[PDB]
Every structure is written in C-alpha cells, then in structure tokens.
C-alpha cells in the first residue's frame, strides 16, 4: 500500500532544427492525468483524466509556466552535458527526468524519487534520504558538485515531503471512483493445436486495473516459468490492461496444466484450466 504521483519529462535536442522538444506527462498510480508538449501550436498543460478538469486557471497557468521554464532549464542542461561528454554539436541527445512521491495507506510519505537519465542511461539520482545524490559517471560528478553547492537536494526534498504528498491526497479524493476501484481481470484459457501432437494453452487476463498482476502456468502443481511465453502487460486503451501467458504442451497433457491469476481485484487467486 498504497499510492504514487509521478512526473515523466523528456527533452530531445534537435541540432539545426530549433529548440529541443520538451514533453511532460503526469500520473497518479497507473492513470495519466496531465500532459504538456513544447511542440504543440500553443503549449499548455492539458487535462488527461476527467477528475483533473475541475482545476481552475491558476492551476493550469502555474503549471504551464513551470513546464516552459523547465524546458528552458533542460535546454541549458543538454548544452552542458554535450560539453561534459565532449560530444559533437550535430547529434541528437535525450535528457529524461522522473520524480514523485509514494504514500502509504495513511497518506504519509513512504519514498521520494528524483532521477535523471542522459541518452537512455542513469545520470544522477536523489538518494532515499532526499539529502544526497548518486552520480552514475564522471560527467554526473560535475552536476553533483553544482547541485550540492546550490542546495538542490533541499529544494527537491521540500516538494517531495510537502506539496507532492498534498497534491496526491487531493487527486486521490477527486478521482476515487477510478483510482481506488478494483477492476478484476476477466480470465479464460484458449487452446490452439500446433500439430497432431502439440498444442498451445494461452491464459488470458483482460480489462483489469491496476496494471499489477501475476499469471503463471503450473503442470501437476510445478511452475513452468522457463517454458512459459509471457507478454508485457499492455494498455487496452480504455484505462484498463491486458496480459497473457502461453505454454506449448504435448497433446493429452492439457488437463495437468493450470493457470494461476493473482490481482488486487480478486478476493482469492484463481486456478484455471482449458474448459473444452
């Protein structure tokens, strides 16, 4: 237990093609609620969940101005990092930021996050104590020293322990109809003969929320982890998720195989078989 708020920023330099593109998305648990795109005709923070639409102009305008200023800060950081790594002025580079708060069932802060990546790999992150940094390479040691001198960890900590927890509490209350609601998976086992001697058993879980789930195949009660093809949990497009797990079995062994489904929406985990 129990909830998180996270922001995901992506800045991409485009040398000789103008300013870097800045995109931000905000989430409460597995639900996206806001976005900002510097490439849009009139960049502004926009609602992406019905429950955030009630916020006043002071909310949207304050946030729009933060994103526009953050995009400018990211443009300078991209310039500074290109120099740290002695990289050409022509190549495109990416700077990603991910931050937010995790709260327990009593609404109190469990963990704060403030992490950065450059060109797809860890660059610098705020430690669990929210007072110190972890640089992933010598270039990031330069940023670490700048942020230690500028007392950046205190500025992040102030938000993570204060505002972050308070906004999450407000959003949870406004969006409880969806945010707290269990949406159990709808489950079924399909059977697909491959030849006269082998068949695929595929265990489906559909229309579930939250995204967290475990699907496993057992044979006579023994885990078939190594022989199971498991796809990544995918969005259905209606704020629910889907997943499946398949196993190739010799014909005649089907009834010895059982699919185990674990999800918060279910009172007890399920044990399912092909129901011909």
């Amino acid at each position: 237990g129990s909830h998180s708020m996270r922001y995901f920023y992506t800045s991409v330099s485009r040398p000789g093609r103008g300013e870097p593109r800045f995109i931000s998305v905000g989430y409460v648990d597995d639900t996206q609620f806001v976005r900002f795109d510097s490439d849009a005709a009139s960049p502004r923070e926009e609602p992406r969940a019905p429950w955030i639409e009630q916020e006043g102009p002071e909310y949207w305008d304050r946030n729009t101005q933060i994103y526009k200023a953050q995009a400018q800060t990211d443009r300078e950081s991209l310039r500074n990092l290109r120099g740290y790594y002695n990289q050409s002025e022509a190549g495109s580079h990416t700077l990603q930021s991910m931050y937010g708060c995790d709260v327990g069932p009593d609404g109190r802060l469990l963990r704060g996050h403030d992490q950065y990546a450059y060109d797809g790999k860890d660059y610098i992150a705020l430690n669990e104590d929210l007072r110190s940094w972890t640089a992933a390479d010598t270039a990031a040691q330069i940023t670490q020293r700048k942020w230690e001198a500028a007392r950046e960890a205190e500025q992040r900590r102030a938000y993570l322990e204060g505002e972050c927890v308070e906004w999450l509490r407000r959003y949870l209350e406004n969006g409880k109809d969806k945010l707290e609601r269990a949406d159990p998976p709808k489950t079924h086992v399909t059977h697909h003969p491959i030849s006269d001697h082998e068949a695929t058993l595929r265990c489906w879980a559909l229309g579930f929320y939250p995204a967290e789930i475990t699907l496993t195949w057992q044979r006579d009660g023994e885990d078939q982890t190594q022989d199971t093809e498991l796809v990544e949990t995918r969005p259905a497009g209606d704020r629910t998720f889907q997943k499946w797990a398949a196993v190739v079995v010799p014909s005649g062994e089907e009834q010895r195989y059982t699919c185990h489904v674990q999800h918060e929406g279910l009172p007890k985990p399920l044990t399912l078989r092909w129901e011909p």
Partner: peptide, 9 residues
C-alpha cells in the same frame, strides 16, 4: 502539480 524548475545540470 509539478515541481518548480531545477538549477541547470
């Protein structure tokens, strides 16, 4: 709501 912007890296 988002955090107020950081110092440059």
């Amino acid at each position: 709501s988002p955090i107020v912007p950081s110092f440059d890296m």
